[PDB]
C-alpha cells in the first residue's frame, strides 16, 4: 500500500543500500522466498481471526446478560422459601 512506501524508501535513500547496489538476482532463491511470504499471510491472519473472534465474544456474553432496571429483586424469591 502507498501508506508504508516512504518509511522504507527514505532509509534506503540514506547512506544505506542504493539503487545501483541492488544485485537484482532472479534465481531459485526467489521462488522459495515467495511461498514463505504467503505462508506468513496464512499464519498471521490465523492469529488475527483468533484475536478478532475473542474480542467480539468478550463483547457478546455481556450483551446476552440482560441488565434489569434494578439489580436487587433476584434474591427475594429464594428468601421467602
Amino acid at each position: 500500500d502507498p501508506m508504508t512506501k516512504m518509511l522504507v524508501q527514505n532509509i534506503f535513500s540514506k547512506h544505506g543500500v542504493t539503487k545501483d547496489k541492488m544485485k537484482k538476482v532472479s534465481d531459485e532463491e526467489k521462488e522459495m522466498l515467495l511461498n514463505l511470504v504467503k505462508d506468513l499471510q496464512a499464519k498471521s491472519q490465523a492469529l488475527i481471526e483468533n484475536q478478532k473472534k475473542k474480542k467480539e465474544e468478550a463483547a457478546a456474553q455481556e450483551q446476552k446478560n440482560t441488565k434489569p432496571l434494578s439489580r436487587r429483586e433476584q434474591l427475594i424469591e429464594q428468601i421467602r422459601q
Binding site: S70, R71, R72, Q74, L75, I76, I79, R80
Partner: protein, 125 residues
C-alpha cells in the same frame, strides 16, 4: 432449631445477592506494579447481609398472615438497594506503581443506619 436454621439459611442467599452488586472493571495501561486492595469489603458485606436477614426474620416470626410478612420484608430489601455507593481510590505512588483500593466506608456507615433500625424494631416489640 427452627429460628437458628432459618436465619442461617437466609444469610447466604442475601449475602450472595449483595456481592453480585459489587462487580466492576478496572483497565490499567502501561504499568508494572499493580496492587488491588479489597480488604473489609467481604467483612462489611457479611455483617450487613447477616444483620439484614435479622430484620426480615424478626417480623416474619412474630407476625402471622405471611402476606404482610412478605410486604415488610420486601420494603427492607429496596431500602438497602438505593443510596449505596462505592469508591475506587486510585493512588499513583510512582511512575510505575499504582494502587486500586476499594473503600468500604459507605457500607460501614450504612451498617450503622441498619443497626439503628434493628434497635428501634426491637424496642418497638
Amino acid at each position: 432449631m427452627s429460628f437458628e436454621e432459618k436465619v442461617e439459611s437466609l444469610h447466604p442467599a442475601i449475602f450472595e445477592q449483595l456481592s453480585s452488586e459489587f462487580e466492576q472493571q478496572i483497565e490499567v495501561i502501561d504499568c508494572e506494579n499493580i496492587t488491588i486492595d479489597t480488604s473489609h469489603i467481604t467483612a462489611a458485606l457479611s455483617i450487613q447481609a447477616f444483620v439484614t436477614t435479622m430484620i426480615i426474620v424478626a417480623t416474619q416470626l412474630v407476625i402471622a398472615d405471611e402476606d404482610l410478612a412478605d410486604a415488610v420484608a420486601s420494603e427492607i430489601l429496596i431500602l438497602d438497594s438505593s443510596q449505596i455507593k462505592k469508591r475506587t481510590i486510585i493512588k499513583i505512588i510512582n511512575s510505575r506503581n499504582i494502587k486500586i483500593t476499594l473503600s468500604a466506608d459507605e457500607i460501614i456507615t450504612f451498617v450503622q443506619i441498619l443497626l439503628q433500625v434493628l434497635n428501634s424494631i426491637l424496642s418497638e416489640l
